Amino acid sequence: GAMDPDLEATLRAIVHSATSLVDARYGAMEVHDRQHRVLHFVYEGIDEETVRRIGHLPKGLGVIGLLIEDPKPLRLDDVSAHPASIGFPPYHPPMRTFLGVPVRVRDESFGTLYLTDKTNGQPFSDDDEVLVQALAAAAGIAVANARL
Amino acid sequence: DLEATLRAIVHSATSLVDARYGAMEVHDRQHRVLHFVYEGIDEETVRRIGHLPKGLGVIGLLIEDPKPLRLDDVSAHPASIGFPPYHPPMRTFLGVPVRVRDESFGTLYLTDKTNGQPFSDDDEVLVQALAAAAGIAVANARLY
Ligand code: HEM
Ligand code: HEM
Ligand SMILES: [Ca+2]
């Protein structure tokens, strides 16, 4: 089933402002069930054809899974060089710089929010980290309340 | 519980945009203030102001018709009612509806970006996104 229309709109707005304000080329969010299972995937910066070529949606594997495992922000200058990296699938754009955080309310986890390839060519900043943390907290609030 | 959530949101809007003051008012359908949460003002001044806002002037504009409002001087707008006595002076303004598609519940608003700067398109987009999450939280509270 599709997401609640208000939750969908809110989550897309959050991904867009995170992406834009942090100057990321790509931004995405995963919404989770219980036992951290991906239910929905919201993203921007990739065109429609490319999405068709990739074909399959992420399972929230690899580096993304560290955001759940270790509920702290993770910044990397070369994402796929990380030993937990599962790598990109065929047709997926290559990505280097990465900023990701768990989407949470208190101790409950609701998903993950992540940005890649800052237009700078530079790594993501502490200010970037702090802003994305705040947007993830807002996302957590939205998910927790759309749900119950 | 819900005020806490609303307080966290006000805090995020104020900090990230770097405004001196931020608040949120939530009203009922007959426009009576149900929640008023704010940031940037000490308890002594608040006591000197006395009475809470009723959602008049520029805020009443935002309630009457909900769409982003961003101004260089809040007092120069034709709908401006003025500040009450003892209220801090404030100049630059950003305000956005707190809503879901079915209904608008209130206003999230910011004043006096540090170093005297006007609020940007970027600020407006950010605050709208944070307000959207408040709208969902309010809607759910209205459903219990
Ligand atoms: C546009 C924003 C996107 C971002 C920021 C992003 C981010 C990432 C990153 C960093 C990885 C590698 C993680 C690792 O190596 O551990 C990854 C893997 C992957 N991506 Fe993307 N991606 C985006 C878009 C997409 C889209 C649109 C699709 C498909 C339509 C997709 C499908 C996949 C798949 C299947 C994987 C393999 C790992 C998994 O399934 O979890 N991605 N993504
Ligand atoms: C610190 C965050 C605050 C912000 C950002 C803020 C902002 C504003 C703005 C923009 C106006 C409208 C002025 C006009 O239309 O010309 C206003 C008026 C007013 N404010 Fe504040 N204010 C804050 C705090 C407070 C507090 C703490 C109180 C009282 C305890 C208060 C009481 C009032 C009253 C009574 C009005 C007159 C209009 C009305 O009743 O709606 N304000 N404020
Ligand atoms: Ca920028």
Short mmCIF file of C-alpha atoms and ligand atoms in Angstrom, two decimals:
data_model
loop_
_atom_site.label_atom_id
_atom_site.label_comp_id
_atom_site.label_asym_id
_atom_site.label_seq_id
_atom_site.Cartn_x
_atom_site.Cartn_y
_atom_site.Cartn_z
CA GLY A 1 0.00 0.00 0.00
CA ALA A 2 0.95 3.63 -0.61
CA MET A 3 1.92 6.03 2.19
CA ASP A 4 -0.57 8.36 3.87
CA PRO A 5 -0.66 11.44 1.55
CA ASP A 6 0.29 13.92 4.33
CA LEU A 7 3.21 11.74 5.46
CA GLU A 8 4.39 11.30 1.88
CA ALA A 9 4.29 15.05 1.17
CA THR A 10 6.09 15.84 4.45
CA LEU A 11 8.83 13.27 3.90
CA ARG A 12 9.45 14.47 0.33
CA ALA A 13 9.72 18.08 1.61
CA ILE A 14 12.24 17.00 4.25
CA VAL A 15 14.38 15.10 1.71
CA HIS A 16 14.27 18.10 -0.66
CA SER A 17 15.33 20.64 1.99
CA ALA A 18 18.05 18.36 3.40
CA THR A 19 19.38 17.80 -0.16
CA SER A 20 19.19 21.48 -1.17
CA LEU A 21 20.48 23.04 2.06
CA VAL A 22 23.42 20.67 2.40
CA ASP A 23 24.09 21.00 -1.38
CA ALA A 24 23.99 17.25 -1.98
CA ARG A 25 23.62 15.93 -5.54
CA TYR A 26 21.46 13.05 -4.25
CA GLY A 27 19.21 12.59 -1.21
CA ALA A 28 17.10 9.73 0.05
CA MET A 29 15.02 8.37 2.91
CA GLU A 30 14.00 4.84 3.88
CA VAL A 31 10.87 4.29 6.01
CA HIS A 32 10.94 1.12 8.15
CA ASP A 33 8.50 -1.38 9.68
CA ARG A 34 9.38 -3.30 12.85
CA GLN A 35 12.62 -5.30 12.70
CA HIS A 36 14.05 -2.46 10.55
CA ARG A 37 12.47 -3.63 7.28
CA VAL A 38 12.26 -1.06 4.47
CA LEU A 39 8.64 -0.22 3.54
CA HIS A 40 9.06 2.95 1.46
CA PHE A 41 11.91 4.69 -0.27
CA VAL A 42 11.84 8.40 -1.12
CA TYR A 43 14.71 9.96 -3.13
CA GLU A 44 15.65 12.83 -5.48
CA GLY A 45 18.40 13.80 -7.90
CA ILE A 46 18.18 10.66 -10.05
CA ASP A 47 16.23 10.88 -13.31
CA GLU A 48 13.38 8.53 -14.24
CA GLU A 49 15.23 6.53 -16.93
CA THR A 50 18.15 5.80 -14.58
CA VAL A 51 15.67 4.56 -11.93
CA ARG A 52 14.16 2.27 -14.60
CA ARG A 53 17.64 0.97 -15.48
CA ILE A 54 18.54 0.23 -11.82
CA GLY A 55 15.21 -1.63 -11.59
CA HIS A 56 15.28 -2.99 -8.03
CA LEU A 57 14.81 -0.84 -4.92
CA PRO A 58 17.30 -0.86 -2.00
CA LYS A 59 16.88 -3.31 0.89
CA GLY A 60 18.69 -0.87 3.22
CA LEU A 61 21.90 -2.87 3.05
CA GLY A 62 25.59 -2.16 3.64
CA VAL A 63 26.63 1.27 4.89
CA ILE A 64 22.96 2.35 5.23
CA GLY A 65 22.57 -0.52 7.73
CA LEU A 66 25.18 1.01 10.04
CA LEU A 67 22.81 3.94 10.68
CA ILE A 68 20.45 1.43 12.31
CA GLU A 69 23.19 -0.66 13.95
CA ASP A 70 24.91 2.45 15.35
CA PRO A 71 22.28 5.25 15.83
CA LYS A 72 24.80 8.08 15.32
CA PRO A 73 25.52 10.23 12.26
CA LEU A 74 27.97 8.71 9.80
CA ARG A 75 30.09 10.81 7.46
CA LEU A 76 32.32 9.24 4.82
CA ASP A 77 34.46 10.72 2.07
CA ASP A 78 34.43 7.48 0.05
CA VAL A 79 31.27 5.49 0.86
CA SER A 80 32.00 2.29 -1.11
CA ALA A 81 35.51 1.99 0.36
CA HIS A 82 33.92 1.23 3.74
CA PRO A 83 34.36 -2.51 4.61
CA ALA A 84 30.62 -2.77 5.35
CA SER A 85 29.82 -1.38 1.89
CA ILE A 86 27.85 -3.81 -0.28
CA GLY A 87 28.53 -1.69 -3.38
CA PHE A 88 26.28 -0.06 -5.98
CA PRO A 89 24.09 -2.11 -8.33
CA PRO A 90 24.26 -2.00 -12.16
CA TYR A 91 23.29 1.38 -13.63
CA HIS A 92 23.39 3.10 -10.21
CA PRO A 93 25.32 6.42 -10.26
CA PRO A 94 28.75 6.20 -8.59
CA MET A 95 28.81 8.02 -5.24
CA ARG A 96 31.66 9.13 -2.98
CA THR A 97 30.85 11.56 -0.14
CA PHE A 98 28.10 10.46 2.23
CA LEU A 99 26.12 11.86 5.15
CA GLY A 100 23.55 9.59 6.82
CA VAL A 101 21.59 9.58 10.10
CA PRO A 102 18.92 7.38 11.73
CA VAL A 103 15.36 8.74 11.58
CA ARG A 104 14.17 8.35 15.18
CA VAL A 105 11.95 9.49 18.07
CA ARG A 106 13.53 8.82 21.50
CA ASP A 107 14.60 5.13 21.36
CA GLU A 108 12.33 4.06 18.47
CA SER A 109 13.84 3.82 14.99
CA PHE A 110 11.65 4.63 11.97
CA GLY A 111 14.12 4.73 9.08
CA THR A 112 17.27 6.45 7.84
CA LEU A 113 17.98 9.67 5.92
CA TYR A 114 21.06 10.08 3.71
CA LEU A 115 22.72 12.44 1.24
CA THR A 116 25.62 11.96 -1.16
CA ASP A 117 27.97 13.84 -3.48
CA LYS A 118 28.11 17.40 -2.13
CA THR A 119 28.48 19.65 -5.21
CA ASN A 120 31.59 21.10 -3.56
CA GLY A 121 33.59 17.99 -4.34
CA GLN A 122 34.16 18.47 -0.60
CA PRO A 123 33.12 16.37 2.41
CA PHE A 124 29.95 17.16 4.34
CA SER A 125 30.43 19.67 7.15
CA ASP A 126 29.52 19.64 10.85
CA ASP A 127 26.80 22.18 10.03
CA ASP A 128 25.55 19.72 7.42
CA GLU A 129 25.51 17.01 10.06
CA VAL A 130 23.60 19.15 12.59
CA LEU A 131 20.98 20.19 10.02
CA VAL A 132 20.34 16.66 8.73
CA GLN A 133 20.06 15.40 12.32
CA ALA A 134 17.31 17.99 12.89
CA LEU A 135 15.46 17.09 9.70
CA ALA A 136 15.62 13.40 10.69
CA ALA A 137 14.10 14.23 14.09
CA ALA A 138 11.26 16.03 12.27
CA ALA A 139 10.85 13.01 9.96
CA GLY A 140 10.72 10.74 13.04
CA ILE A 141 7.99 12.96 14.51
CA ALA A 142 6.02 12.75 11.24
CA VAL A 143 6.34 8.95 10.93
CA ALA A 144 5.45 8.33 14.60
CA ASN A 145 2.30 10.44 14.38
CA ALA A 146 1.04 9.38 10.96
CA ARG A 147 1.25 5.88 12.42
CA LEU A 148 -0.27 6.36 15.92
CA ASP B 1 4.00 15.66 25.42
CA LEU B 2 2.64 17.42 22.30
CA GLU B 3 3.89 20.84 23.45
CA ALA B 4 7.33 19.21 23.83
CA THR B 5 7.11 18.09 20.17
CA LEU B 6 6.00 21.56 19.18
CA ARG B 7 8.80 23.04 21.29
CA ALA B 8 11.39 20.81 19.59
CA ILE B 9 10.13 21.95 16.18
CA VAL B 10 10.19 25.67 17.12
CA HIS B 11 13.74 25.10 18.42
CA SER B 12 14.86 23.46 15.14
CA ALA B 13 13.33 26.27 13.05
CA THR B 14 14.94 29.00 15.22
CA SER B 15 18.43 27.40 15.43
CA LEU B 16 18.87 26.22 11.85
CA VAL B 17 17.67 29.52 10.33
CA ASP B 18 19.58 31.42 13.05
CA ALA B 19 16.62 33.64 14.08
CA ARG B 20 16.64 35.45 17.42
CA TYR B 21 13.01 34.68 18.11
CA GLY B 22 10.65 31.91 17.07
CA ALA B 23 7.19 30.83 18.10
CA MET B 24 4.24 28.64 17.26
CA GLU B 25 0.56 29.26 17.88
CA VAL B 26 -2.03 26.50 17.52
CA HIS B 27 -5.68 27.57 17.37
CA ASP B 28 -9.08 25.85 17.39
CA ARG B 29 -11.67 26.27 14.59
CA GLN B 30 -13.03 29.46 16.20
CA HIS B 31 -9.45 30.81 16.37
CA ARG B 32 -8.91 30.56 20.12
CA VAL B 33 -5.27 29.93 21.05
CA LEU B 34 -4.79 26.35 22.26
CA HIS B 35 -0.97 26.26 22.38
CA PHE B 36 1.63 29.00 22.39
CA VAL B 37 5.27 27.94 22.43
CA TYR B 38 8.15 30.30 21.82
CA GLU B 39 11.88 30.81 21.93
CA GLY B 40 14.33 33.66 22.32
CA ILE B 41 12.74 35.63 25.17
CA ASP B 42 13.55 35.53 28.90
CA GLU B 43 10.90 34.90 31.56
CA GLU B 44 11.04 38.46 32.97
CA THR B 45 10.12 40.12 29.67
CA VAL B 46 7.35 37.56 29.12
CA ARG B 47 5.94 38.53 32.54
CA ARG B 48 6.15 42.23 31.60
CA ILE B 49 4.24 41.60 28.37
CA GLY B 50 1.58 39.83 30.47
CA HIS B 51 -1.16 38.66 28.08
CA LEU B 52 -0.69 36.02 25.38
CA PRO B 53 -1.19 36.81 21.66
CA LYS B 54 -4.66 36.28 20.18
CA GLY B 55 -3.43 35.75 16.63
CA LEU B 56 -3.99 39.31 15.44
CA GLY B 57 -2.31 41.46 12.79
CA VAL B 58 0.22 39.65 10.61
CA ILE B 59 -0.35 36.31 12.39
CA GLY B 60 -4.10 36.79 11.93
CA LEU B 61 -3.31 37.27 8.26
CA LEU B 62 -1.55 33.89 8.24
CA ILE B 63 -4.56 32.28 9.91
CA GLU B 64 -7.13 33.98 7.65
CA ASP B 65 -5.27 32.62 4.61
CA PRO B 66 -2.52 30.03 5.04
CA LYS B 67 0.54 30.63 2.84
CA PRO B 68 4.21 31.49 3.56
CA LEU B 69 4.80 35.07 4.64
CA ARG B 70 8.24 36.59 4.61
CA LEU B 71 8.88 40.29 5.32
CA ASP B 72 11.79 42.72 5.81
CA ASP B 73 9.89 44.84 8.36
CA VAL B 74 6.96 43.18 10.15
CA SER B 75 5.53 46.56 11.23
CA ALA B 76 5.40 48.07 7.71
CA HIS B 77 2.83 45.48 6.48
CA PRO B 78 -0.73 46.92 6.14
CA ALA B 79 -2.14 44.12 8.33
CA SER B 80 0.32 44.86 11.14
CA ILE B 81 -1.36 45.46 14.50
CA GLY B 82 1.80 46.44 16.41
CA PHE B 83 3.57 45.01 19.43
CA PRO B 84 2.07 45.31 22.91
CA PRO B 85 4.01 47.28 25.55
CA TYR B 86 7.23 45.59 26.81
CA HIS B 87 7.39 43.25 23.79
CA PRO B 88 10.89 43.10 22.25
CA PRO B 89 11.28 45.05 19.04
CA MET B 90 11.39 42.70 16.06
CA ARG B 91 11.79 43.55 12.38
CA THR B 92 12.37 40.69 9.89
CA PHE B 93 9.61 38.10 9.63
CA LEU B 94 9.04 34.55 8.40
CA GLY B 95 5.76 32.73 8.91
CA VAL B 96 4.21 29.55 7.50
CA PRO B 97 1.04 27.50 8.12
CA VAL B 98 1.11 24.43 10.33
CA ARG B 99 -1.30 22.13 8.49
CA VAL B 100 -2.27 18.87 6.80
CA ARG B 101 -4.18 18.93 3.47
CA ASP B 102 -7.57 18.63 5.25
CA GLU B 103 -7.04 21.49 7.73
CA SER B 104 -4.69 24.25 8.96
CA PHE B 105 -4.10 24.30 12.73
CA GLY B 106 -1.68 27.13 13.41
CA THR B 107 1.39 29.14 12.48
CA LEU B 108 5.15 28.66 12.90
CA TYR B 109 6.94 32.00 12.85
CA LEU B 110 10.40 33.48 13.09
CA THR B 111 11.82 36.93 13.54
CA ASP B 112 15.12 38.78 13.45
CA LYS B 113 17.60 36.64 11.60
CA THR B 114 20.98 37.37 13.16
CA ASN B 115 23.18 40.04 11.59
CA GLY B 116 20.03 41.88 10.38
CA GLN B 117 19.51 39.73 7.30
CA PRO B 118 16.21 39.09 5.47
CA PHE B 119 14.83 35.54 5.49
CA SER B 120 15.67 33.61 2.33
CA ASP B 121 13.79 31.26 -0.04
CA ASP B 122 15.94 28.52 1.58
CA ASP B 123 14.72 29.47 5.06
CA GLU B 124 11.07 29.49 3.85
CA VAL B 125 11.44 26.02 2.33
CA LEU B 126 13.10 24.64 5.48
CA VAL B 127 10.51 26.09 7.88
CA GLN B 128 7.65 24.80 5.65
CA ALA B 129 9.12 21.28 5.89
CA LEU B 130 9.46 21.44 9.71
CA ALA B 131 5.92 22.87 9.95
CA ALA B 132 4.61 19.93 7.89
CA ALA B 133 5.84 17.53 10.59
CA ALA B 134 4.15 19.70 13.24
CA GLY B 135 0.93 19.58 11.20
CA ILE B 136 0.95 15.76 11.29
CA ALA B 137 1.65 15.75 15.05
CA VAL B 138 -1.19 18.23 15.71
CA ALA B 139 -3.62 16.30 13.46
CA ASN B 140 -2.92 13.10 15.40
CA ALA B 141 -3.43 14.86 18.76
CA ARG B 142 -6.80 16.13 17.45
CA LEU B 143 -7.53 12.43 16.79
CA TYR B 144 -7.31 11.23 20.42
C1 HEM C 1 18.93 9.37 -5.26
C2 HEM C 1 19.35 9.11 -4.02
C3 HEM C 1 20.14 7.83 -3.65
C4 HEM C 1 21.08 7.76 -2.70
C5 HEM C 1 21.56 8.95 -1.82
C6 HEM C 1 21.57 6.40 -2.64
C7 HEM C 1 22.54 5.90 -1.79
C8 HEM C 1 23.07 4.63 -1.85
C9 HEM C 1 24.36 4.22 -1.35
C10 HEM C 1 25.38 5.15 -0.64
C11 HEM C 1 24.49 2.92 -1.61
C12 HEM C 1 25.71 2.04 -1.29
C13 HEM C 1 25.66 1.65 0.17
C14 HEM C 1 26.76 0.66 0.42
O1 HEM C 1 27.66 0.51 -0.45
O2 HEM C 1 26.72 0.03 1.50
C15 HEM C 1 23.29 2.46 -2.29
C16 HEM C 1 23.01 1.18 -2.73
C17 HEM C 1 21.92 0.76 -3.46
N1 HEM C 1 21.01 1.56 -4.15
FE1 HEM C 1 20.97 3.67 -3.96
N2 HEM C 1 20.87 5.65 -3.57
C18 HEM C 1 19.98 6.50 -4.22
C19 HEM C 1 19.10 6.14 -5.22
C20 HEM C 1 18.73 4.87 -5.59
C21 HEM C 1 17.62 4.50 -6.47
C22 HEM C 1 16.67 5.51 -7.16
C23 HEM C 1 17.60 3.15 -6.56
C24 HEM C 1 16.65 2.22 -7.36
C25 HEM C 1 15.60 2.63 -8.08
C26 HEM C 1 18.68 2.64 -5.74
C27 HEM C 1 19.00 1.31 -5.56
C28 HEM C 1 20.03 0.81 -4.79
C29 HEM C 1 20.28 -0.59 -4.51
C30 HEM C 1 19.46 -1.81 -4.99
C31 HEM C 1 21.52 -0.62 -3.63
C32 HEM C 1 22.21 -1.88 -3.05
C33 HEM C 1 22.12 -1.90 -1.53
C34 HEM C 1 20.70 -2.08 -1.04
O3 HEM C 1 19.89 -2.74 -1.73
O4 HEM C 1 20.40 -1.57 0.07
N3 HEM C 1 19.34 3.71 -5.17
N4 HEM C 1 22.44 3.53 -2.42
C1 HEM C 2 9.61 34.93 21.28
C2 HEM C 2 8.86 34.65 20.20
C3 HEM C 2 7.86 35.69 19.67
C4 HEM C 2 7.72 36.06 18.39
C5 HEM C 2 8.56 35.50 17.23
C6 HEM C 2 6.67 37.05 18.32
C7 HEM C 2 6.22 37.72 17.20
C8 HEM C 2 5.14 38.58 17.16
C9 HEM C 2 4.63 39.20 15.95
C10 HEM C 2 5.22 38.98 14.54
C11 HEM C 2 3.58 39.96 16.29
C12 HEM C 2 2.69 40.78 15.30
C13 HEM C 2 3.07 42.24 15.23
C14 HEM C 2 2.28 42.92 14.14
O1 HEM C 2 1.35 42.30 13.55
O2 HEM C 2 2.59 44.10 13.85
C15 HEM C 2 3.38 39.83 17.73
C16 HEM C 2 2.41 40.46 18.47
C17 HEM C 2 2.03 40.17 19.75
N1 HEM C 2 2.76 39.40 20.65
FE1 HEM C 2 4.59 38.43 20.17
N2 HEM C 2 6.20 37.26 19.61
C18 HEM C 2 6.90 36.43 20.47
C19 HEM C 2 6.71 36.33 21.83
C20 HEM C 2 5.61 36.77 22.53
C21 HEM C 2 5.27 36.44 23.91
C22 HEM C 2 6.12 35.53 24.81
C23 HEM C 2 4.12 37.08 24.21
C24 HEM C 2 3.30 37.11 25.53
C25 HEM C 2 3.58 36.34 26.61
C26 HEM C 2 3.72 37.82 23.03
C27 HEM C 2 2.59 38.59 22.95
C28 HEM C 2 2.11 39.29 21.86
C29 HEM C 2 0.86 40.01 21.80
C30 HEM C 2 -0.19 40.16 22.92
C31 HEM C 2 0.80 40.59 20.39
C32 HEM C 2 -0.31 41.46 19.78
C33 HEM C 2 -1.03 40.75 18.63
C34 HEM C 2 -1.84 39.58 19.11
O3 HEM C 2 -2.42 39.64 20.22
O4 HEM C 2 -1.92 38.57 18.35
N3 HEM C 2 4.65 37.61 22.03
N4 HEM C 2 4.36 39.00 18.23
CA CA C 3 24.12 26.31 -0.60
#
